[PDB]
Short mmCIF file of C-alpha atoms and ligand atoms in Angstrom, two decimals:
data_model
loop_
_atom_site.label_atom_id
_atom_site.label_comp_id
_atom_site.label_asym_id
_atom_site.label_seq_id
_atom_site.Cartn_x
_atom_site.Cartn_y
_atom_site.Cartn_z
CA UNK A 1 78.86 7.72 55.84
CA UNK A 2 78.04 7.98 52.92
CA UNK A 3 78.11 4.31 52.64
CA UNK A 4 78.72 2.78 48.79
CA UNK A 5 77.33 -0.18 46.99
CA UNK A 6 79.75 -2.27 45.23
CA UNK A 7 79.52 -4.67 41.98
CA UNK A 8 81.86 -6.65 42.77
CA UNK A 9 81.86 -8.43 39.16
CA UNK A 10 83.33 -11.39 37.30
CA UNK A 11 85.59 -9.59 34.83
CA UNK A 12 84.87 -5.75 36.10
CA UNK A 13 83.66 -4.26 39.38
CA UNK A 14 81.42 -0.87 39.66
CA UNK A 15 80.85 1.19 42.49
CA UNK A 16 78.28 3.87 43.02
CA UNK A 17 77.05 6.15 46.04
CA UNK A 18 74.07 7.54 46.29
CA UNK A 19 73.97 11.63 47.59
CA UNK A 20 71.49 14.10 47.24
CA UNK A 21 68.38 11.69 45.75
CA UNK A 22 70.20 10.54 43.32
CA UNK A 23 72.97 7.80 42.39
CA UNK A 24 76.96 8.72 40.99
CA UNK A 25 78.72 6.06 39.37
CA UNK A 26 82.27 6.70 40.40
CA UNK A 27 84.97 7.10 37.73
CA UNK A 28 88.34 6.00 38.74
CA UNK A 29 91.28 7.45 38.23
CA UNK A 30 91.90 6.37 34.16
CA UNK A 31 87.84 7.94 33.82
CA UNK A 32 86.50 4.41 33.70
CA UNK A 33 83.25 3.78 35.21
CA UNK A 34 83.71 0.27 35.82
CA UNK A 35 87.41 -1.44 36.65
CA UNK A 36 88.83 -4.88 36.07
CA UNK A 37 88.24 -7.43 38.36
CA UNK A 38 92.00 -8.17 38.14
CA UNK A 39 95.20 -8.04 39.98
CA UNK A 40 98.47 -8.71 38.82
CA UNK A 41 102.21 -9.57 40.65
CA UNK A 42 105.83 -8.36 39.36
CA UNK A 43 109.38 -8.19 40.36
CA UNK A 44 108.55 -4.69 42.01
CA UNK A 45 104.92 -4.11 42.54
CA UNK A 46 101.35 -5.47 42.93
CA UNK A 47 99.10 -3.54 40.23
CA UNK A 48 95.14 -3.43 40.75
CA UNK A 49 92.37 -2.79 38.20
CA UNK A 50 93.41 -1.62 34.75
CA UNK A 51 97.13 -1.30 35.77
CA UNK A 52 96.79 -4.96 35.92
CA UNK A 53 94.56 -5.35 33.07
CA UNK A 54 96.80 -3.25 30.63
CA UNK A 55 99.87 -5.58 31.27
CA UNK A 56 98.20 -8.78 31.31
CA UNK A 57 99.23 -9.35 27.54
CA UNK A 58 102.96 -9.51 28.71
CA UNK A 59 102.77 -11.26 32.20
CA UNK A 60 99.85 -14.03 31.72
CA UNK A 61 101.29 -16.28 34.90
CA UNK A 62 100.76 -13.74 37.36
CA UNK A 63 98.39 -11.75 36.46
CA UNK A 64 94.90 -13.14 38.44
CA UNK A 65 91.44 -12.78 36.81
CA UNK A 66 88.17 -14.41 37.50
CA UNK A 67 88.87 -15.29 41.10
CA UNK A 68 84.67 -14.60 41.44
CA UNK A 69 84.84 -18.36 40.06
CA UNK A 70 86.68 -19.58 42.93
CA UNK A 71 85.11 -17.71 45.73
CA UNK A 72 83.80 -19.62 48.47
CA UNK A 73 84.13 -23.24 47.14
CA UNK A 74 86.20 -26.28 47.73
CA UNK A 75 89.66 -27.38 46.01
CA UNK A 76 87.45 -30.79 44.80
CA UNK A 77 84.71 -28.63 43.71
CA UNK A 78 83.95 -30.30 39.63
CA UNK A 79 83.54 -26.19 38.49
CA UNK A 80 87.54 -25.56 40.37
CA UNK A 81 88.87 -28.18 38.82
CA UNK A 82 87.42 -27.47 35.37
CA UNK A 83 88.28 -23.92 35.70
CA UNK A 84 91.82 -24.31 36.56
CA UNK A 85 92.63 -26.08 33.34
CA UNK A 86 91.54 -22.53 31.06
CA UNK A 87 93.94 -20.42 33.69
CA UNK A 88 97.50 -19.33 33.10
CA UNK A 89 98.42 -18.76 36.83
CA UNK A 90 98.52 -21.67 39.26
CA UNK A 91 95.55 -22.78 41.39
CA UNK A 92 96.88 -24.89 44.40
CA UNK A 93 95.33 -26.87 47.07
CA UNK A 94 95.96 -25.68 50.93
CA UNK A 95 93.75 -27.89 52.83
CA UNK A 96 91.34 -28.36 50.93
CA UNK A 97 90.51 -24.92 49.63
CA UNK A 98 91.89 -23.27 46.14
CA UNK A 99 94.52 -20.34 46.42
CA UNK A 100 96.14 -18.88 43.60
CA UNK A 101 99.93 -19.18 43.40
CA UNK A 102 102.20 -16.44 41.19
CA UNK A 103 105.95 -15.13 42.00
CA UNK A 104 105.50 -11.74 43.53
CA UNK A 105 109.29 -9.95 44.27
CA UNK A 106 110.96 -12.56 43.22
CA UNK A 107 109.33 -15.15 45.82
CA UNK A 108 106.02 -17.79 45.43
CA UNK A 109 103.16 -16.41 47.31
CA UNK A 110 99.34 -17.88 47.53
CA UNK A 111 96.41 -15.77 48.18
CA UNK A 112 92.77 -17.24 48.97
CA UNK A 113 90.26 -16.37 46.21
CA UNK A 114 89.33 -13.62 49.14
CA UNK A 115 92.61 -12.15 49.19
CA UNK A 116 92.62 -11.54 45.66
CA UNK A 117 89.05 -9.96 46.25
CA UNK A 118 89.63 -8.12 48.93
CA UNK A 119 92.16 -5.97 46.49
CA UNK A 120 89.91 -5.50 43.72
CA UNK A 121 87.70 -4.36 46.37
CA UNK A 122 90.02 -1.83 47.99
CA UNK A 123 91.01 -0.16 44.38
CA UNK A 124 86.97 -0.03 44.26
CA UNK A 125 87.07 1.57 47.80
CA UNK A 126 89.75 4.09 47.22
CA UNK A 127 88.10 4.73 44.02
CA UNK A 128 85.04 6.19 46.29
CA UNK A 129 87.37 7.98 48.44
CA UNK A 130 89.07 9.53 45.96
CA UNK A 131 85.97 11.09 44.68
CA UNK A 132 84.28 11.48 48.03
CA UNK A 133 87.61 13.27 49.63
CA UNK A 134 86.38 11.07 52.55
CA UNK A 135 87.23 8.01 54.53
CA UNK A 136 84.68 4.89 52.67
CA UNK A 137 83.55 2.32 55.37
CA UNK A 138 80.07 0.70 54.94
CA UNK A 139 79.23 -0.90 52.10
CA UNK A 140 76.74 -3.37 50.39
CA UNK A 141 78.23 -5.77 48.01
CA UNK A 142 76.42 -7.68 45.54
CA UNK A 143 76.56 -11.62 44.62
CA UNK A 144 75.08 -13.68 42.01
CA UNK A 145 71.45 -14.85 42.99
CA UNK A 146 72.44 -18.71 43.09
CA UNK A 147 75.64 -17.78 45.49
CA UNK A 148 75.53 -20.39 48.81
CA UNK A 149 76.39 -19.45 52.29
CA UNK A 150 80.19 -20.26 51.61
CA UNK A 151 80.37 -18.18 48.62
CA UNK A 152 77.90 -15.24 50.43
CA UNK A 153 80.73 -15.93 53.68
CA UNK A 154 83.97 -15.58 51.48
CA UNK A 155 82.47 -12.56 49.33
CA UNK A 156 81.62 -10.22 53.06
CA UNK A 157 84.89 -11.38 54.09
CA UNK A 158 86.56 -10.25 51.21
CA UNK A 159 85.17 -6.93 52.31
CA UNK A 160 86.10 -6.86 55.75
CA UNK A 161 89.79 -7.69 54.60
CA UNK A 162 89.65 -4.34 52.03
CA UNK A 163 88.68 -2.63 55.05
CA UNK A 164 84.92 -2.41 54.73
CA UNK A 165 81.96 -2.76 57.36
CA UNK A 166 79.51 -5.01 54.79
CA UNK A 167 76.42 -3.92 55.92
CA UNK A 168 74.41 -6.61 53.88
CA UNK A 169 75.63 -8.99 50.69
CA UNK A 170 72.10 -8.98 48.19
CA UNK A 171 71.58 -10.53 44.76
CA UNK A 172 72.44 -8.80 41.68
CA UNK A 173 69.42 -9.44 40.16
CA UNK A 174 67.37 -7.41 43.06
CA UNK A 175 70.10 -4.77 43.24
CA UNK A 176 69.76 -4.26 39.36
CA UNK A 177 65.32 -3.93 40.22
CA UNK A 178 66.02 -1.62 43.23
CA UNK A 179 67.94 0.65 40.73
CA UNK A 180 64.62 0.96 38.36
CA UNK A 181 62.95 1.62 41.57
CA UNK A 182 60.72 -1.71 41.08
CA UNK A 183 60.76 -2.34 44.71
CA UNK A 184 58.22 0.33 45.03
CA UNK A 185 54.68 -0.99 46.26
CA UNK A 186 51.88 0.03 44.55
CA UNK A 187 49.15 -2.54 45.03
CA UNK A 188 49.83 -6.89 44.37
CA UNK A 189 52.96 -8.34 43.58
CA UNK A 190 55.17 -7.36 40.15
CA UNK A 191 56.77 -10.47 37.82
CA UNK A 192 60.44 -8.92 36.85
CA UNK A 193 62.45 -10.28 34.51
CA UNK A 194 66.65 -9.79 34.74
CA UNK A 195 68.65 -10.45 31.61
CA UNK A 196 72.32 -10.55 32.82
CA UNK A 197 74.85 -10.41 29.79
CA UNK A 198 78.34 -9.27 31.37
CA UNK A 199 82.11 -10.21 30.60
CA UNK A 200 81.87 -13.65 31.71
CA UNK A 201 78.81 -15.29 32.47
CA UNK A 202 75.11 -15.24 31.48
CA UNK A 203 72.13 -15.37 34.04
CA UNK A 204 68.29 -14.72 33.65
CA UNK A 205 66.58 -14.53 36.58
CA UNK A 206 62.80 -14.17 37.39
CA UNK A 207 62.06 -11.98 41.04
CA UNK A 208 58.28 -11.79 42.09
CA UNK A 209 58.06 -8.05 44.27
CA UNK A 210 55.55 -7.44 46.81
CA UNK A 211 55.73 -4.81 49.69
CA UNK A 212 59.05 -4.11 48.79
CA UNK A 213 59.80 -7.94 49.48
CA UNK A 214 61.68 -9.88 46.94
CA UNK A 215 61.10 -13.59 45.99
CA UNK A 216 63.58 -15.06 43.69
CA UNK A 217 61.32 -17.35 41.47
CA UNK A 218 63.75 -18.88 39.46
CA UNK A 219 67.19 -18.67 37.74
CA UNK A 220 68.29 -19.98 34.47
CA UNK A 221 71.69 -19.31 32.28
CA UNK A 222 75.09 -20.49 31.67
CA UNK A 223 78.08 -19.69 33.94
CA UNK A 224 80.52 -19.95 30.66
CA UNK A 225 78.91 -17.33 27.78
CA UNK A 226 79.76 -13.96 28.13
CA UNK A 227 81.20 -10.87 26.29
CA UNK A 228 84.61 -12.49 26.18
CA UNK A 229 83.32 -15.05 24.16
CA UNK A 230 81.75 -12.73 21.45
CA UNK A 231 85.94 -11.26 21.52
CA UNK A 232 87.16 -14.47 20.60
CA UNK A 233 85.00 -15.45 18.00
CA UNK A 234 86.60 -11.85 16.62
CA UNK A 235 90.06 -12.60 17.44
CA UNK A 236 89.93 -16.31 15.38
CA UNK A 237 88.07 -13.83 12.27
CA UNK A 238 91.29 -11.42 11.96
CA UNK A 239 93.69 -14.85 12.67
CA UNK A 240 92.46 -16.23 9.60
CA UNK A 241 92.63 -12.20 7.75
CA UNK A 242 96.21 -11.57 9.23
CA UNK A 243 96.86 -15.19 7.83
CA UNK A 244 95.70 -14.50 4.13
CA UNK A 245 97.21 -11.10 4.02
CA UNK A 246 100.76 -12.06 5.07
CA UNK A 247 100.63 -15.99 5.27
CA UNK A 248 101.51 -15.79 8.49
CA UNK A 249 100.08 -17.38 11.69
CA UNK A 250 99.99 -15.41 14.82
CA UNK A 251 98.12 -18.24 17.00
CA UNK A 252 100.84 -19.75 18.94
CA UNK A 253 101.99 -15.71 19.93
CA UNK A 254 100.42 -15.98 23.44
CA UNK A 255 100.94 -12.16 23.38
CA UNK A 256 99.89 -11.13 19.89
CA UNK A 257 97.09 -12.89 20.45
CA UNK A 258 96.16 -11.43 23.81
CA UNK A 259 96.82 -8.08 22.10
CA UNK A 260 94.14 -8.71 19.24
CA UNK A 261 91.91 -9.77 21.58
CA UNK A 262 92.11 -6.43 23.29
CA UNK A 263 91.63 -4.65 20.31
CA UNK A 264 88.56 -6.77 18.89
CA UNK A 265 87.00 -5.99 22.74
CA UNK A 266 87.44 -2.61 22.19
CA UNK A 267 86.02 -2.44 18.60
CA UNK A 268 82.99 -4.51 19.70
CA UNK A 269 81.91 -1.98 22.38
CA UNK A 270 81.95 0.53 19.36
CA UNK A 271 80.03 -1.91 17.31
CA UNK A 272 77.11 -1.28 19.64
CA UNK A 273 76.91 2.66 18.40
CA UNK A 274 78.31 2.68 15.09
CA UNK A 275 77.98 -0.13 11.89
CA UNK A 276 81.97 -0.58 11.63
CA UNK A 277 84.68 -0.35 13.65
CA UNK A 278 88.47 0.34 12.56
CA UNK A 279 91.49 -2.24 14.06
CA UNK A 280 94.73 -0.82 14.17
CA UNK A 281 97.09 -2.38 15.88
CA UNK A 282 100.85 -1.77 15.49
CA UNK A 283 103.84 -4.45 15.45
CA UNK A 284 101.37 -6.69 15.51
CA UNK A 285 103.86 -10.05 14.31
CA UNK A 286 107.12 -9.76 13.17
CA UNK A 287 106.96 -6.11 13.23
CA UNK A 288 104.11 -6.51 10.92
CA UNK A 289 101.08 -3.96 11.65
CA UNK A 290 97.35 -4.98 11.47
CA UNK A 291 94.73 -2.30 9.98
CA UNK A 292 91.92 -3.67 9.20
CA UNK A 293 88.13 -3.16 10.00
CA UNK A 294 84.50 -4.96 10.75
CA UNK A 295 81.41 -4.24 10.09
CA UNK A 296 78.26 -4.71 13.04
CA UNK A 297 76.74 -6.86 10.13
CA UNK A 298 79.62 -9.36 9.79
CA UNK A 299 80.47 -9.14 14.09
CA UNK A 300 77.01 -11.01 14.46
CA UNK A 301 77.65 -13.25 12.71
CA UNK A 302 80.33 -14.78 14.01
CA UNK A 303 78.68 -14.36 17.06
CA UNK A 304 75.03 -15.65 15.12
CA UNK A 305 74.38 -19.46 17.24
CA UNK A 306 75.84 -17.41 20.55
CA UNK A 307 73.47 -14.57 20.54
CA UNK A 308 70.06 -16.82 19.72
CA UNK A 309 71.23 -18.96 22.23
CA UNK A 310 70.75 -16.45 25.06
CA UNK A 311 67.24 -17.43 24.25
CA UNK A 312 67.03 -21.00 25.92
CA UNK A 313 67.76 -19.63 29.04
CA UNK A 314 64.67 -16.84 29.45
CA UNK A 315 62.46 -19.81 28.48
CA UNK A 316 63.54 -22.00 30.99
CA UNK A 317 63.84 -19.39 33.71
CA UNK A 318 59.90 -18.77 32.45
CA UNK A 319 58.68 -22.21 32.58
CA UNK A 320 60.29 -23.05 36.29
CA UNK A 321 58.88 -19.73 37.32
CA UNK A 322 55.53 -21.15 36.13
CA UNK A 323 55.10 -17.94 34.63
CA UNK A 324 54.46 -16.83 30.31
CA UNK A 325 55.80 -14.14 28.75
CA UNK A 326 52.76 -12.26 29.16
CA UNK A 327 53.34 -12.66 33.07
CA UNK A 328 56.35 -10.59 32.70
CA UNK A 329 55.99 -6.93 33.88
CA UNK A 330 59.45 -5.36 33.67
CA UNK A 331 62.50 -6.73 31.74
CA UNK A 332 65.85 -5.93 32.92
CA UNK A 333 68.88 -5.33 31.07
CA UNK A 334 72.68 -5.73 32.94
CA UNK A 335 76.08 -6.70 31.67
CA UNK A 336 77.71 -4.63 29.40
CA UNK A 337 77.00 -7.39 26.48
CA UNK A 338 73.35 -6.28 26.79
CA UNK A 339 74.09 -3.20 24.91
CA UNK A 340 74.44 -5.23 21.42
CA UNK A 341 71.74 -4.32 19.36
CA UNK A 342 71.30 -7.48 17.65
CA UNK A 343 70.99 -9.13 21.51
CA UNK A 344 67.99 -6.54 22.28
CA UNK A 345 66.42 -7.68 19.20
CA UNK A 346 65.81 -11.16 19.95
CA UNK A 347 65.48 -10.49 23.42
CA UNK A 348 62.68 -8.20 22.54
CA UNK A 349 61.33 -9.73 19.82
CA UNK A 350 60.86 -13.15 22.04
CA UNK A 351 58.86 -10.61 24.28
CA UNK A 352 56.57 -9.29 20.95
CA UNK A 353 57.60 -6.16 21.45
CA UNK A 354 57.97 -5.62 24.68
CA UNK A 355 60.01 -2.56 25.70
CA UNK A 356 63.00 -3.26 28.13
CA UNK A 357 64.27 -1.26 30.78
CA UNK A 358 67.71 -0.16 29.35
CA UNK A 359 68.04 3.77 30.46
CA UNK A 360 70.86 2.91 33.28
CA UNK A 361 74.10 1.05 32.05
CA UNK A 362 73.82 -2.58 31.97
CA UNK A 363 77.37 -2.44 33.47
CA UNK A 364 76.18 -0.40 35.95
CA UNK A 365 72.92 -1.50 37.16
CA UNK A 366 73.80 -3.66 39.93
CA UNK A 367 76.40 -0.98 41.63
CA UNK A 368 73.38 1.46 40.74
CA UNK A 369 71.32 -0.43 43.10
CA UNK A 370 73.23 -1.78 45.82
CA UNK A 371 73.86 2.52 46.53
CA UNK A 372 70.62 2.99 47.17
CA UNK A 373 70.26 0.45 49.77
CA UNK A 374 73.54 1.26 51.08
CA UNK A 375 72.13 4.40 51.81
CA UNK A 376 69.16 2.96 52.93
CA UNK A 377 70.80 0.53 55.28
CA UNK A 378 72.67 3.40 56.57
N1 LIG B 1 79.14 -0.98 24.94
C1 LIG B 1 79.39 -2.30 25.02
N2 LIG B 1 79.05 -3.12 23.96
C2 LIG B 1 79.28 -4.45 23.99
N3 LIG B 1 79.85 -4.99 25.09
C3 LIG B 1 80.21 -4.25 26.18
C4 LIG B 1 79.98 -2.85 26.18
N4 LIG B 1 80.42 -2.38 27.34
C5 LIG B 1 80.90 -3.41 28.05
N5 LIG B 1 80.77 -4.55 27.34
C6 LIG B 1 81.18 -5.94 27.77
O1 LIG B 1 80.68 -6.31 29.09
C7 LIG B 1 81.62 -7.27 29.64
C8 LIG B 1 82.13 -7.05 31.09
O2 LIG B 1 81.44 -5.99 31.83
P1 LIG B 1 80.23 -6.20 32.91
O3 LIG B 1 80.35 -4.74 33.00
O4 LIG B 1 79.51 -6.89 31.83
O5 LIG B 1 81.29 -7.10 33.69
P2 LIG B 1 81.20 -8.46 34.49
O6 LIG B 1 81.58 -9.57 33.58
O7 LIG B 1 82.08 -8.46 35.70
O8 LIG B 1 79.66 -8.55 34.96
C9 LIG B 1 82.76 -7.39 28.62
O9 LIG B 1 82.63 -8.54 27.78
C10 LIG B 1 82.68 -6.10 27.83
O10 LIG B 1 83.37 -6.16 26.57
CL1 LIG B 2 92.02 3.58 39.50
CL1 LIG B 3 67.15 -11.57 15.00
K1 LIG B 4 80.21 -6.06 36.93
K1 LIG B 5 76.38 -11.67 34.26
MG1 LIG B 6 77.75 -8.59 36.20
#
């Protein structure tokens, strides 16, 4: 005690604990309120979070990512082996089950998609200590609402191995209600709505609450469209600038172009306050620097067919629910890609109108909630 609640995300993991009546999201030690879900292997050392993150531009083979993709499932699973193909570092088959393979001290080690979660999870654990100036030991951890028993089994043992007593494993999509307080009873049952836009993938799901009893209605979205694919529609925009400018082609420059990406990531999340955003990014090719800049205007646009098509999704989720968009009562808004303006806009206007719930970071929703059943649990 306290116990925490922990996002344990796709492409970034949040953790929160709730003191006092009220929930802190817990900055780590760079002042970020959320941290990569990444973990990356060198001559010397194992780096977790953004130490990882900040080098991955420089060491692609053994620097792991997206390990949330592998959690819990089979080496012959159709989604493993169509995953592995998009990776730089080495998937490998040990019985049966996927483990990632990089050179760590000069030697070939393989981790279980656990392992590699387990150590996002302690960085997210320490990251609690370090603000609690106290030992961290229960926790809930979040999973995605269409999760199985394996994955559910892999993800609380990927606690236990950090070090943490999982005191439950819920659905993001309840966590991110319980932090709007929408598992409050206040008569018959409540239609909500969760719009999930984060780094990687894209889920809507539909929860009917009733006594403080969640039903998941139905789920609807697409495991492949996230945030990171609004970045690269960026990064292929300043290919063909930095082409024009200095006919010169940076795409085969694994590391200039992991470098642009960063920076078109960064000037997207400024996109979502301001109308333009400035790129400067030095040595870019050659020794050639890139200043440039991109207007909110032209960034949707490029991104134009992806953003509408967010849209498909709610009306699916809607029609399995059996439900219309009048039956909605409270829309939802997590993933850090919900903050784009022009995504809230056809989000909303599909809903006439309809205001969404957006006062808690998207990004942060989920940990938000899982604190205050941690603290409930405990
Ligand atoms: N202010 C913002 N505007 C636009 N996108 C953002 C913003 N903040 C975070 N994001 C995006 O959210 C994604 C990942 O964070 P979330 O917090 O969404 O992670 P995860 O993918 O693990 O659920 C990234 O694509 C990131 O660029
Ligand atoms: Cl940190
Ligand atoms: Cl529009
Ligand atoms: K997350
Ligand atoms: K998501
Ligand atoms: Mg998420």
């Amino acid at each position: 005690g306290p116990a925490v609640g922990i996002d344990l995300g796709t492409t970034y993991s949040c953790v929160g604990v709730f003191q006092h009546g009220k929930v802190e999201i817990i900055a780590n030690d760079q002042g970020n309120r959320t941290t990569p879900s990444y973990v990356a292997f060198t001559d010397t050392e194992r780096l977790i979070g953004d130490a990882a993150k900040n080098q991955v531009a420089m060491n692609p083979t053994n620097t792991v990512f997206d390990a949330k993709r592998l959690i819990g499932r089979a080496f012959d699973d159709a989604v493993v082996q169509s995953d592995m193909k998009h990776w730089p570092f080495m998937v490998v088959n040990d019985a049966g089950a996927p483990k990632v393979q990089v050179e760590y001290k000069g030697e070939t080690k393989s981790f279980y998609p656990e392992e590699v979660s387990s150590m996002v999870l302690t960085k997210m654990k320490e990251i609690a200590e370090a603000y609690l100036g106290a030992t961290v030991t229960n926790a809930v951890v979040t999973v995605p609402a269409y999760f199985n028993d394996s994955q559910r089994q892999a993800t609380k043992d990927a606690g236990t191995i950090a070090g943490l007593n999982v005191l439950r494993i819920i659905n993001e999509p309840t966590a991110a209600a319980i932090a709007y307080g929408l598992d409050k009873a206040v008569g018959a049952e409540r239609n909500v709505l969760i719009f999930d836009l984060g780094g990687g993938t894209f889920s809507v799901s539909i929860l009917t609450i009733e006594d403080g009893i969640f039903e998941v209605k139905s789920t609807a979205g697409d495991t492949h469209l996230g945030g990171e694919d609004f970045d690269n529609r960026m990064v292929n925009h300043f290919i063909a600038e930095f082409k024009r400018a200095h006919a010169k082609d940076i795409s085969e420059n694994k590391r200039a172009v992991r470098r642009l990406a960063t920076a078109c990531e960064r000037a997207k999340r400024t996109l979502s306050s301001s109308t333009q955003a400035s790129i400067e990014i030095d040595s870019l090719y050659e020794g050639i620097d890139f200043y440039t800049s991109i207007t909110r205007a032209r960034f949707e646009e490029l991104n134009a067919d992806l953003f509408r098509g967010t849209l498909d999704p709610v009306e699916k989720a809607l029609r399995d629910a059996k439900l219309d968009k009048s039956q909605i009562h409270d829309i939802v808004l997590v993933g850090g890609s919900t903050r784009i303006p022009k995504i809230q806009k056809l989000l909303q206007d599909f809903f006439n109108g309809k205001e969404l719930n957006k006062s808690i970071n998207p990004d942060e929703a989920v940990a938000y909630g899982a604190a205050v059943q941690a603290a409930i649990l405990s």
